[PDB]
Every structure is written in structure tokens, then in C-alpha cells.
Structure 1
């Protein structure tokens, strides 16, 4: 838990909170396999006085390869209130994602989650796990993929990733829950290439809304999807247009 010179993309900061847009390949808190090089280390470097705050102000987290907005507390009073707001579900975070398979409707995945028995670094859906609820809506259709927006009622480890895989729609690029299957038929070279290069779950926390812990004023931030997802979506969109062009000139 030493400070490390790790650049953070600060979207907003006041006397009490910091909002950051987290990139891929960045673990939030030290753990098995990641002793350092995390957001916590970066925060200790950016604002050393944050060391006096539990878990360095970290109230909520995002997977290493999941991108997006997160709020960090700069003081104990802010941290305590943020954690309470979080537990009361008064902190809304919306995610954008691209899933495998053509989906015909939005919905909800309400399936208990538990640690995987065999795999130590895996989570899994199981009837004797703990309650988990994921809501999703279809934003855009692709040939054999779907662009989604999600909101959660619970926020467990790998929840979205394991929930989507459970309903046979794992996130594209997910190296753990089946997000890297063989490319679809009729795929162009650029499409096959883009899919080959996209090696992380296509998941981004694009919106964060909360009540300031001190002022109580409602605030909201937006973070556009990263360039990697933009390119992924652009090629899927190109593929779908070509697909829909099948008999447009017949």
C-alpha cells in the first residue's frame, strides 16, 4: 500500500469527492495477483492525505478491464456517507456493454451469485449463492451481437459479466465467461480482426449519479465509451448494414 506514480483521469473534484474515469488494465484495490499498481496506489500518490481515509476513499469498484466512472471519498465523513448512500442504492451507475448473440428484448437477470467451487478466480450463478439483480435494455441491434445499457440493484464481483453469460449472452471480449468464441460467418476481415484484438469484456460505466455527501446536491457525470468499444461498435454496425443490404437492390 505504497504511493505509486500512476496517472488518473479526474473528471471532477471538489473538497470532498473525486470522480475518475478508469481505463482498462487497472485494478482498483490490491489483492491476490495484484499487490500494487492499483487505483489505491495512484490515489496515495495523487493525494497522500487520503491515507487517513478507510481504503483510501474507495467506496465502489470496477474490474481491472472494465472501464468507467467511479467516485472516491477524500474525507472520512464523505466516505461514511457515500458508503451509506451506496447501500441505500442512492448512487446510480449505468453501464454500456456489447454482448454476444442477437437479443430480442431487454430484461432482468435475478440469479444468485457465488464463488466458483473449482476455479478460484471465477464467480458463478448458483441457487445457493447470494441474491443478485441485473437490469438491461437493448440500445442497438447488430447481426449476432447486441449493444446494451444496464443498471443494477446489487453490485457483486463480476455480476454483469456472469449474469450475461448465464443467459447465453456473455460480453464480447470477456476472457473468463466465454466472450471470445469463434467469429460469426460472413464476417469481413476488419470485423474478424477487430474481434481478435478486443481482449477485454465490452463493459463501460458511462454514467454516475449521486447526491453530494456533504451538500446533498444531486450530481451526474457522463463518460463516453472508450475508443476500443467505439471501433468495435462501428465495425459491427458496418457488418449489420452490409447484412441488411442483402436484397435492397434486388
Structure 2
């Protein structure tokens, strides 16, 4: 019935403008067996995305995922040609920004994992019926990732 609400924290590339919804059917990739690409005759899917703040050529954003299928959040974020930061399988080729500092380039090399994190989960108790709310602290790699981007954005553009 799609009752449980799930929230995700992600970092993507590009200067975003506004949030919205994506509704694209998805099936298996015709050629590569480790990719799950968008297909017009695929399984219907719904995903929503919002933005909390922008950066130089990247962004920090909060979004909610309805169906927790295999790598749903990555492709729907990549179907708008705005791939995730550091994603090796679904994210785009590395593209450092103009006038990037050496420390910034190292951070992207250091952050060699996918930019995804779940912070807030809401559930209904089995035998009580009272909502529980929990929050997940931002992981250390993401803390430095947003820190280096904040310093770079406040130095180049400003």
C-alpha cells in the first residue's frame, strides 16, 4: 500500500534549480547485466526529489523514495542527466569544475563511494500503533565532502 515513508540524502553534479517528480518505467539494461536502465516498457516507478542547498557545480539535496528497488534512486536522478557524485557504475565520467583547488580534486578521489545516505525513517509499531521517528547522523565522509564544496563555492563564486 506504500505506507512507510523513506528519506534519502544525496549529492549530485550540476547547478540545480528546483525540485519535482520523476515517473519513468524501468527494466534491465539490454546489453550490460549489471545496469538497470530506464525503459519505456519497463516496470512503472515513482520518485520525488527536493533540494536544500546548491554548490559550485554540485548540490546537496533531500529526497524521498517510494519503491526500494535495486538502484532506483540513482537512475531516476541520472535520467535527468544529473548523475550522482562519485558513482562509478551509474554516475557520469569525472568532471572537476573550473579553477578547482588541489584539495577539492583529492576529496573526489578520496570520496570514491556512491553519494547516498538515509537519514530519517518513519515506521508504525506492530502491536502498539504509535509512530516512531529516528534520525541518522551525517557520515564523516559526507561531512568533509560538503565542507570542501562550501569552502570552494564561497571562494570562487564570491
TM over 0.5: yes
Q: Quickly name the TM-score band, shorter chain normalised.
A: over 0.9
Q: In structure 2, what is the Cα distance between the partners aligned to 1:200 and 1:129?
A: 28
Query: Which protein is richer in helix relative to its size?
Result: 1
Contact kept? 1:179, 1:201, Cα under 8 Å: no
Q: In structure 2, what is the Cα distance between the partners aligned to 1:132 and 1:154?
A: 7
Residue by residue over 1:96-151, the C-alpha shift from the partner in whole angstroms, topping out at 9 and shown as x without a partner, is 11001111111111111111111111100110111111111111110101111011
Q: In structure 1, what is the Cα distance between the partners aligned to 2:112 and 2:83?
A: 13
Matched position secondary structure for 2:48: strand
Contact kept? 2:21, 2:49, Cα under 8 Å: yes
Q: In structure 2, what is the Cα distance between the partners aligned to 1:180 and 1:174?
A: 9
- Per the TM alignment, residue 243 of structure 1 is displaced from its structure 2 partner at its CA by 2.1
Contact kept? 1:139, 1:148, Cα under 8 Å: yes
**Higher relative contact order, structure no. (Cα contacts within 8 Å, ≥ 6 residues apart):** 2
Structure 1 residue 239 corresponds to structure 2 residue 135:
no
Structure-2-length-normalised TM-score: 0.94
Matched position secondary structure for 1:192: helix
- Per the TM alignment, residue 221 of structure 1 is displaced from its structure 2 partner at its CA by 0.6
Quote the residue 1:139 is aligned against.
52
* 1:54-65 matches, cutoff 5 A: none
Structure-1-length-normalised TM-score: 0.61
Contact kept? 1:174, 1:180, Cα under 8 Å: no
Q: In structure 2, what is the Cα distance between the partners aligned to 1:113 and 1:206?
A: 26
Contact kept? 1:95, 1:207, Cα under 8 Å: yes
Q: In structure 2, what is the Cα distance between the partners aligned to 1:161 and 1:180?
A: 15
Residue by residue over 1:137-194, the C-alpha shift from the partner in whole angstroms, topping out at 9 and shown as x without a partner, is 1111101011110112222211111111110111101111124513111111111000
Unaligned segments of structure 2, at least 5 residues: none
Contact kept? 1:173, 1:180, Cα under 8 Å: no
Structure 1 residues 179, 204: closer, same or farther in 2, change over 3 A?
farther
Larger Rg: 1
Residue by residue over 1:38-92, the C-alpha shift from the partner in whole angstroms, topping out at 9 and shown as x without a partner, is xxxxxxxxxxxxxxxxxxxxxxxxxxxxxxxxxxxxxxxxxxxxxxxxxx22211
Contact kept? 1:210, 1:220, Cα under 8 Å: yes
Query: Which protein is richer in strand relative to its size?
Result: 1
Matched position secondary structure for 1:96: strand
Unaligned segments of structure 1, at least 5 residues: 1-87, 245-250
Structure 1 residues 179, 172: closer, same or farther in 2, change over 3 A?
farther
